[PDB]
Amino acid sequence: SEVANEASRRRTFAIISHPDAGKTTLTEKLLLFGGAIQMAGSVKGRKTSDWMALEKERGISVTSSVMQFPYEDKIVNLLDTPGHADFGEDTYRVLTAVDSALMVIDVAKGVEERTIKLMEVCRLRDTPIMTFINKLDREGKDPIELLDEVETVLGIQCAPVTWPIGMGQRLKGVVHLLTGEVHLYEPGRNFTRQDSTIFPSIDAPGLAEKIGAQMLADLRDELELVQGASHPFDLEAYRAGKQTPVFFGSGVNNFGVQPLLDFFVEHAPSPQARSTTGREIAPEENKLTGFVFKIQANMDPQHRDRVAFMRVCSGRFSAGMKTFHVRTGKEMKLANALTFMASDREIAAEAWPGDVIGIHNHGTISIGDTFTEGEAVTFTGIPNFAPELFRRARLRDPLKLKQLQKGLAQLSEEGATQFFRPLTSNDLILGAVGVLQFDVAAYRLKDEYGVEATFEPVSVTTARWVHCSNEKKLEEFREKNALNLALDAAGHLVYLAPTRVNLQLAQERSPDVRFSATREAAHT
Ligand SMILES: Nc1nc2c(ncn2[C@@H]2O[C@H](COP(=O)(O)OP(=O)(O)O)[C@@H](O)[C@H]2O)c(=O)[nH]1
Numbered sequence: 303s304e305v306a307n308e309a310s311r312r313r314t315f316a317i318i319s320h321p322d323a324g325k326t327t328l329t330e331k332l333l334l335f336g337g338a339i340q341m342a343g344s345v346k347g348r349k350t351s352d353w354m355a356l357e358k359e360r361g362i363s364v365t366s367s368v369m370q371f372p373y374e375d376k377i378v379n380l381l382d383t384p385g386h387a388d389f390g391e392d393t394y395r396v397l398t399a400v401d402s403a404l405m406v407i408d409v410a411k412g413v414e415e416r417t418i419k420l421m422e423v424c425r426l427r428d429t430p431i432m433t434f435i436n437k438l439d440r441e442g443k444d445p446i447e448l449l450d451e452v453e454t455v456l457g458i459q460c461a462p463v464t465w466p467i468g469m470g471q472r473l474k475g476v477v478h479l480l481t482g483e484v485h486l487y488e489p490g491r492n493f494t495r496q497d498s499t500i501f502p503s504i505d506a507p508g509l510a511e512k513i514g515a516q517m518l519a520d521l522r523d524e525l526e527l528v529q530g531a532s533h534p535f536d537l538e539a540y541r542a543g544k545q546t547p548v549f550f551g552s553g554v555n556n557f558g559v560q561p562l563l564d565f566f567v568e569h570a571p572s573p574q575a576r577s578t579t580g581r582e583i584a585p586e587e588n589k590l591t592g593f594v595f596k597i598q599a600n601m602d603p604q605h606r607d608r609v610a611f612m613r614v615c616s617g618r619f620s621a622g623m624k625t626f627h628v629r630t631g632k633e634m635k636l637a638n639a640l641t642f643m644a645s646d647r648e649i650a651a652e653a654w655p656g657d658v659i660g661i662h663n664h665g666t667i668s669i670g671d672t673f674t675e676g677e678a679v680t681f682t683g684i685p686n687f688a689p690e691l692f693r694r695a696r697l698r699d700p701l702k703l704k705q706l707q708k709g710l711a712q713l714s715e716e717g718a719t720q721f722f723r724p725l726t727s728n729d730l731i732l733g734a735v736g737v738l739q740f741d742v743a744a745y746r747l748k749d750e751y752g753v754e755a756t757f758e759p760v761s762v763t764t765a766r767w768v769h770c771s772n773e774k775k776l777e778e779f780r781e782k783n784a785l786n787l788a789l790d791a792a793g794h795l796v797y798l799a800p801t802r803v804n805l806q807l808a809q810e811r812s813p814d815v816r817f818s819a820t821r822e823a824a825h826t
Pocket residue numbers: 319320321322323324325326327328385436437438439440551552553554555
């Protein structure tokens with residue numbers, strides 16, 4: 303069928319990186335291959351009018367959230383993961399609306415703090431991971447050691463697919479480990495199809511006349527070790543999230559990028575079956591389905607447009623179709639909704655399973671909302687994430703407590719911020735993932751709700767959701783740790799911890815108590 307075909311082309315993925323790894327550099331070089339030259343320049347330019355400044359305050363992002371582009375007859379949906387000033391909870395959430403992930407690692411650094419946390423988010427869905435080691439034009443760690451670093455630190459098996467030849471001032475090129483080809487690193491080239499120097503084999507004549515006899519011999523030495531030690535690429539493993547094919551390159555020069563992109567579109571998974579409150583929803587179904595996973599402000603001179611982001615999981619979207627908002631129950635007509643075909647010639651008014659659409663939100667869409675054509679079904683798997691920045695609410699005029707908690711609880715629905723009411727206090731504690739969510743709730747509470755407020759930091763570092771079967775044994779825990787407990791906007795029990803250390807002690811004192819770092823956004 304027409305849907306099954308279009309879904310089979312889709313490659314929906316995001317990049318996970320520690321900052322300054324190369325995420326925006328490597329995004330540009332791929333937008334080049336998709337023919338999105340116009341967007342490619344604005345993404346590199348992302349490194350002023352008065353009303354756009356106020357819009358920066360309301361929560362818009364300069365870089366486009368979603369970048370779709372075609373490559374080798376596949377449709378590549380590249381969902382952004384803002385890592386800089388706009389880092390926040392939405393960054394963690396984007397990963398739950400993809401099927402595959404590309405990890406970028408600086409070779410000088412290695413695995414880094416943001417690498418580790420993003421990779422943990424991918425472990426939740428067992429998302430497949432591909433690895434690209436960046437910045438080989440400058441000196442860095444040994445590849446053999448960097449593989450063990452990934453393996454031991456990140457926990458995932460390593461199956462390299464390309465392999466470097468030197469690095470830094472001494473970099474000569476990569477060697478493909480499946481095709482046997484030997485791409486060369488050299489100037490004046492964009493490293494594309496016709497614009498590259500590719501030997502078909504290591505034993506091809508003249509290779510030593512190009513990479514030096516010494517470096518060819520040391521390359522034979524390194525391969526013999528990788529062959530008899532590192533594991534070869536097992537697609538079944540990669541698909542189950544238990545293995546990552548590794549690529550080495552130099553994104554700033556587009557070197558090694560294309561082999562990665564060709565390998566990616568060949569093997570990365572097409573849209574798969576997600577789960578709902580009961581039955582599994584396959585991507586080949588006739589009716590349209592999908593879940594809202596992100597809500598942001600859309601660049602608006604009226605400073606009033608919010609757009610909820612929705613990934614499509616079955617059927618076909620067409621501009622102006624009647625949808626079924628399972629929660630509210632009202633028929634919703636997706637009017638003037640947003641597609642993200644970023645290409646100077648290509649322009650498409652529809653979207654297929656794996657794509658993302660932008661539903662202009664007027665206030666009644668919250669995170670995790672499931673849109674269908676009439677089937678009462680509700681997607682599961684959409685998580686809320688344990689905050690990592692906590693602050694208390696500071697209101698100058700106390701006559702706005704009624705309206706403050708009204709605004710706050712709604713900002714929780716739309717994913718602005720989480721909102722915690724301690725069992726032994728009327729304080730209101732706002733958990734976020736990035737600093738920016740606080741300035742946003744500031745403006746939004748003032749602008750929308752008229753509550754001039756402030757957020758002073760508290761002695762809270764991490765939070766865990768609490769669940770336990772035994773009704774009495776939980777109450778022996780509710781009254782024991784009550785000072786450290788709160789309720790969130792959903793009414794779940796949250797252990798607000800002053801430190802990671804206090805939490806581990808808390809986890810051990812209560813052996814029969816579940817401490818989980820995630821929670822479904824559907825009040826359950
Ligand atoms: N030497 C070298 N520098 C790079 C490479 N890729 C990115 N950079 C540099 O890293 C800086 C910004 O990297 P960026 O793409 O913005 O990483 P991001 O912050 O994770 O998006 C720039 O100064 C780039 O010149 C590379 O392959 N080699």
